[PDB]
Amino acid sequence: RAARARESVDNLYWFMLAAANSAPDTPAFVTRGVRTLSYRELRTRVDDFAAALAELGLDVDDRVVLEANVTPDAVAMLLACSLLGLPFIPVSPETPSGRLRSILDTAEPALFAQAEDGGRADVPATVGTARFGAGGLRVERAPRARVRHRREIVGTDTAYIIFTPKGVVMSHRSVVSLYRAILEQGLITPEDRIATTSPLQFDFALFDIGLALGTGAALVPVPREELNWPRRFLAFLGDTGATQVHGVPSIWRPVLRHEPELLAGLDRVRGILFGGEDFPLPELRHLQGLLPHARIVNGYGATESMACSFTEVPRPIPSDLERLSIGFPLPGFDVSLLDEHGRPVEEIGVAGQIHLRAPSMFSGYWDDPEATARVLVSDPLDPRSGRTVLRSGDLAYRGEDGELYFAGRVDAQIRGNRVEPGEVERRLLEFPGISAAVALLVPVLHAFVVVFDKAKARAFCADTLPGYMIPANIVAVDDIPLTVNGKVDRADLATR
Amino acid sequence: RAARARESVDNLYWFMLAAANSAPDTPAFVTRGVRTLSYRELRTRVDDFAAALAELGLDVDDRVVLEANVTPDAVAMLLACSLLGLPFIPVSPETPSGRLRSILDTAEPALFAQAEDGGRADVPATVGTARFGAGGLRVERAPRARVRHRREIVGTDTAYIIFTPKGVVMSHRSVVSLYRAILEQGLITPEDRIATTSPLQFDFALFDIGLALGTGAALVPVPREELNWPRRFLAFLGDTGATQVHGVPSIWRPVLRHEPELLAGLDRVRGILFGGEDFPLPELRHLQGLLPHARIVNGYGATESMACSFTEVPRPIPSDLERLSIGFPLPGFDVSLLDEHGRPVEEIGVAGQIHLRAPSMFSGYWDDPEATARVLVSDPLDPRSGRTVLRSGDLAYRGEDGELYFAGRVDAQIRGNRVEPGEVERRLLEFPGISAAVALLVPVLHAFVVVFDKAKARAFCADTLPGYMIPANIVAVDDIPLTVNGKVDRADLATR
Ligand SMILES: Nc1ncnc2c1ncn2[C@@H]1O[C@H](COS(=O)(=O)NC(=O)C[C@H](N)c2ccccc2Br)[C@@H](O)[C@H]1O
Numbered sequence: 001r002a003a004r005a006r007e008s009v010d011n012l013y014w015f016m017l018a019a020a021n022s023a024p025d026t027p028a029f030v031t032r033g034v035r036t037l038s039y040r041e042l043r044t045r046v047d048d049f050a051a052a053l054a055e056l057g058l059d060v061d062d063r064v065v066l067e068a069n070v071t072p073d074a075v076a077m078l079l080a081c082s083l084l085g086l087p088f089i090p091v092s093p094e095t096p097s098g099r100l101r102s103i104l105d106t107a108e109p110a111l112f113a114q115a116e117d118g119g120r121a122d123v124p125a126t127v128g129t130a131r132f133g134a135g136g137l138r139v140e141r142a143p144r145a146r147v148r149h150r151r152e153i154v155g156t157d158t159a160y161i162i163f164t165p166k167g168v169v170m171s172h173r174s175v176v177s178l179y180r181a182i183l184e185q186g187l188i189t190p191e192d193r194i195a196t197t198s199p200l201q202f203d204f205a206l207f208d209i210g211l212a213l214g215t216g217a218a219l220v221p222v223p224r225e226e227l228n229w230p231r232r233f234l235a236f237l238g239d240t241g242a243t244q245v246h247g248v249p250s251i252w253r254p255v256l257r258h259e260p261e262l263l264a265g266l267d268r269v270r271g272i273l274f275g276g277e278d279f280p281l282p283e284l285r286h287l288q289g290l291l292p293h294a295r296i297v298n299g300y301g302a303t304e305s306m307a308c309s310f311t312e313v314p315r316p317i318p319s320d321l322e323r324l325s326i327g328f329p330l331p332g333f334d335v336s337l338l339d340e341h342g343r344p345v346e347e348i349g350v351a352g353q354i355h356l357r358a359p360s361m362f363s364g365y366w367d368d369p370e371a372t373a374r375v376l377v378s379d380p381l382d383p384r385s386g387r388t389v390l391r392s393g394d395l396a397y398r399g400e401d402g403e404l405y406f407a408g409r410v411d412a413q414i415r416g417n418r419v420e421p422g423e424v425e426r427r428l429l430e431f432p433g434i435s436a437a438v439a440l441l442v443p444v445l446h447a448f449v450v451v452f453d454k455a456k457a458r459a460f461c462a463d464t465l466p467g468y469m470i471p472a473n474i475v476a477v478d479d480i481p482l483t484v485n486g487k488v489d490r491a492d493l494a495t496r
Numbered sequence: 497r498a499a500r501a502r503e504s505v506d507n508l509y510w511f512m513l514a515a516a517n518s519a520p521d522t523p524a525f526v527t528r529g530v531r532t533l534s535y536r537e538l539r540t541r542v543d544d545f546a547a548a549l550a551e552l553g554l555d556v557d558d559r560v561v562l563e564a565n566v567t568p569d570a571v572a573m574l575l576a577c578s579l580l581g582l583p584f585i586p587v588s589p590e591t592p593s594g595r596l597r598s599i600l601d602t603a604e605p606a607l608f609a610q611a612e613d614g615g616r617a618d619v620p621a622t623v624g625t626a627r628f629g630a631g632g633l634r635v636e637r638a639p640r641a642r643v644r645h646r647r648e649i650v651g652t653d654t655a656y657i658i659f660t661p662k663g664v665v666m667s668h669r670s671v672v673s674l675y676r677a678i679l680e681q682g683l684i685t686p687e688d689r690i691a692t693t694s695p696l697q698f699d700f701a702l703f704d705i706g707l708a709l710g711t712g713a714a715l716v717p718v719p720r721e722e723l724n725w726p727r728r729f730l731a732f733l734g735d736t737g738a739t740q741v742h743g744v745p746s747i748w749r750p751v752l753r754h755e756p757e758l759l760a761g762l763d764r765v766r767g768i769l770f771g772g773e774d775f776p777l778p779e780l781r782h783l784q785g786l787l788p789h790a791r792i793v794n795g796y797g798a799t800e801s802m803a804c805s806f807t808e809v810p811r812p813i814p815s816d817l818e819r820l821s822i823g824f825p826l827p828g829f830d831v832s833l834l835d836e837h838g839r840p841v842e843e844i845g846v847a848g849q850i851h852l853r854a855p856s857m858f859s860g861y862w863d864d865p866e867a868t869a870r871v872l873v874s875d876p877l878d879p880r881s882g883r884t885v886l887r888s889g890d891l892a893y894r895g896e897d898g899e900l901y902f903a904g905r906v907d908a909q910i911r912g913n914r915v916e917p918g919e920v921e922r923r924l925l926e927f928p929g930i931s932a933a934v935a936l937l938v939p940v941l942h943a944f945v946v947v948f949d950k951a952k953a954r955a956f957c958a959d960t961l962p963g964y965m966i967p968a969n970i971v972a973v974d975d976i977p978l979t980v981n982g983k984v985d986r987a988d989l990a991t992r
Pocket residue numbers: 203204207274275276277278279298299300301302303304306307326392393394406408409
């Protein structure tokens with residue numbers, strides 16, 4: 001009685017499980033005692049979860065909150081939801097109770113599902129509850145009764161909604177279009193094992209999962225408790241035979257600081273992919289020199305299109321390079337840089353706001369048509385057609401070869417001088433004893449460093465940097481704090 | 497210097513010319529002395545036209561008016577425009593000068609192109625002019641100078657704009673999604689020769705072209721001057737070895753009236769496809785009985801998605817059948833019937849307004865965001881996501897098996913009784929001497945018939961029909977008048 005997506009219609013289920021046919025006994029997951037789960041065994045688990053979910057009587061478009069990190073069972077659940085046209089809302093179990101309640105209030109999901117050993121204890125009676133594990137999907141409280149109205153699942157149906165409360169609605173057509181565009185780049189092969197570090201609630205995790213499974217490669221989910229300690233992290237990558245390591249730049253900071261010798265021993269690592277924020281070039285040059293046979297790729301873009309561009313870093317990174325390129329949009333993507341007059345920037349080295357034409361565009365912000373209209377805007381180069389672009393909120397400029405360079409959030413840019421915090425941080429990272437450095441503007445410029453004479457550090461900055469870029473104050477901190485998704489927590493540093 | 501669509505990106509060029517690689521010397525066109533043009537020779541002509549167009553310096557999204565009917569040269573031009581990301585605006589040369597000027601005023605195209613022997617003589621100086629033929633694309637007046645701003649062509653770029661002044665903007669992604677969905681139905685094979693009758697300006701012509709060329713079949717364009725005379729029309733289908741005949745129901749009316757014996761001699765015809773309006777069942781039963789080995793398919797939908805459903809008629813058509821089904825939406829399409837309260841209709845036999853979820857959706861109405869917002873509306877079953885549906889303007893109901901039945905335009909539906917003009921016309925078509933019949937409401941009910949005693953014809957209606965369905969007046973006419981696209985011209989009949 002439940003609708004199911006047809007094989008010919010864009011849908012995560014069919015996209016990620018195609019290798020169960022062409023290579024059933026190849027590994028889809030490697031986990032640690034190292035264990036593998038084949039494509040065939042993954043599809044079996046998806047199909048068993050989907051049979052159980054289909055019993056609950058949910059209509060296509062009914063929302064399922066999936067509280068999990070990246071595991072074989074969580075990926076089996078999101079693929080079962082996919083097949084049934086039930087958009088999933090991934091939430092990491094580290095999400096505070098109040099923030100989850102805020103998501104439940106706005107999203108009004110039919111069902112909340114967590115792992116058998118999950119610890120969420122406080123979900124409202126209107127929301128159904130279930131636990132998933134080895135033993136199948138187990139309903140605790142059934143979702144409320146309803147009538148199904150949707151006969152057939154389409155490509156524009158919602159695959160997932162990313163909540164940060166801002167909810168980015170992605171369609172199956174959009175996410176599959178991003179996977180097809182990156183598969184065309186041959187980043188990885190079926191013999192790769194992709195170590196993924198991002199929380200499931202971050203679309204960088206959903207990118208890694210669909211890249212690996214769509215290619216017929218293996219996914220090696222790195223638990224947060226392994227990632228947080230440098231020798232433990234390196235032993236996990238070695239034991240699992242990871243060939244590719246994906247994550248935000250911060251995943252390398254402890255290893256580079258405490259264990260560079262053991263990092264250099266990861267002889268099977270063929271590639272590193274980072275995204276979500278700038279990689280400090282002194283840290284990136286350190287990593288590149290420890291692993292000379294790992295290709296490093298810089299991934300750029302936003303939840304609103306999943307991503308935009310994937311750009312191999314130069315080998316070696318020029319010692320005087322100020323900014324890595326974010327390259328050229330993927331095939332089928334296009335960028336216009338518009339100035340503050342709404343007009344195209346063609347001039348080399350002049351920043352404008354990225355307006356993106358993408359086949360992977362979000363459907364809209366959940367219950368926020370006004371926010372949608374400010375971001376998905378009429379194409380400024382073709383305003384009479386009805387075609388929309390993503391007004392990205394990002395600045396960038398082009399080089400002599402048409403390649404892009406990211407230039408910060410439009411809304412987050414001293415003495416009539418634009419500060420480049422990356423330039424301040426670069427010069428402090430080059431000061432003897434400084435391991436890490438983050439600069440921020442309260443406008444007053446403070447730097448936080450992981451190690452000390454502040455006065456010697458200021459004069460060292462003043463040797464190369466203009467007056468407006470010299471930090472007013474330099475504060476020693478034990479750690480650079482991170483957001484749940486692994487980005488620099490500048491709001492936390494502002495508090496001290 | 498001109499941008500060109502990449503092979504991996506949805507685009508008419510790559511879609512329609514794939515067979516130039518897999519089957520270069522197979523026929524793409526059959527024309528009449530019967531001549532063929534191979535896939536390889538078509539791609540050569542497209543590439544030569546595209547090289548010439550690329551010289552003009554147009555930017556992606558710049559509009560090209562293509563004044564032509566369906567010919568190898570016109571199809572080569574629309575594919576050259578496709579490759580360069582220049583949306584084409586197809587206009588039939590039968591379009592009156594005033595109507596073309598109205599289109600030029602609103603669309604503001606960069607270029608107007610017509611055939612070497614075309615007769616349009618009055619195009620404004622701001623619009624560039626060119627003629628295309630055997631001898632290539634020939635510029636008469638260059639388009640105005642501009643700066644190109646678009647670096648890369650995407651799938652959401654506009655392929656064409658259909659003007660009726662209402663302009664339906666279609667994307668390459670949308671039109672290719674319709675072709676892929678119909679290719680999945682195996683209507684035709686590469687050995688088919690598809691006789692196409694629609695003017696190029698009607699998207700039924702664009703459907704036939706992409707179906708044939710996407711399949712690797714041959715297209716047999718039927719000139720209007722061959723279509724208008726029944727023996728001439730039948731000799732053309734026989735000489736060209738047509739295996740499939742596509743067109744609006746009116747293309748059969750003269751043949752059925754004057755030449756049913758010769759129609760029965762079309763031994764190579766394996767299939768008939770009609771769309772755009774109801775086929776009067778007495779005429780459709782006549783045709784089906786003359787050509788018992790031709791499959792007949794009923795195509796339903798609107799320019800706004802190109803089409804929705806393709807439904808083989810029953811063989812034979814039940815003599816008591818009142819309404820042909822419009823079946824089930826294609827794979828990847830979905831219909832909700834909503835009532836006048838905006839709520840889903842689940843009840844068998846109750847009409848509601850078709851709301852369509854389609855991968856082939858139009859981008860919007862040209863320069864009419866208000867009309868766009870009244871037609872591409874928030875999904876009424878999922879209004880908080882941002883997902884849109886097509887509010888079709890069509891009524892339909894479902895049968896016991898979930899199949900649809902078209903029930904007229906919502907806006908165009910006597911004594912507190914809904915009139916079904918098809919029922920009036922059916923009973924008059926069954927009256928001895930009546931060849932054709934059209935009923936219309938001025939509300940006063942008039943019927944126009946092609947042949948006579950009006951009084952005997954009224955009493956014959958009154959034998960089976962309720963009082964409110966008996967025509968007030970019956971007028972003998974020589975011909976049922978048609979619109980340029982071949983539909984019943986009810987506005988013309990209203991004038992008499
Ligand atoms: N390479 C980058 N360099 C510098 N800044 C970057 C970068 N990528 C994102 N950003 C910034 O993050 C913003 C996007 O933040 S986000 O919406 O949370 N998305 C992400 O961080 C991850 C992104 N969706 C993504 C997914 C999959 C693969 C790569 C990437 Br990037 C973007 O608009 C930029 O401001």
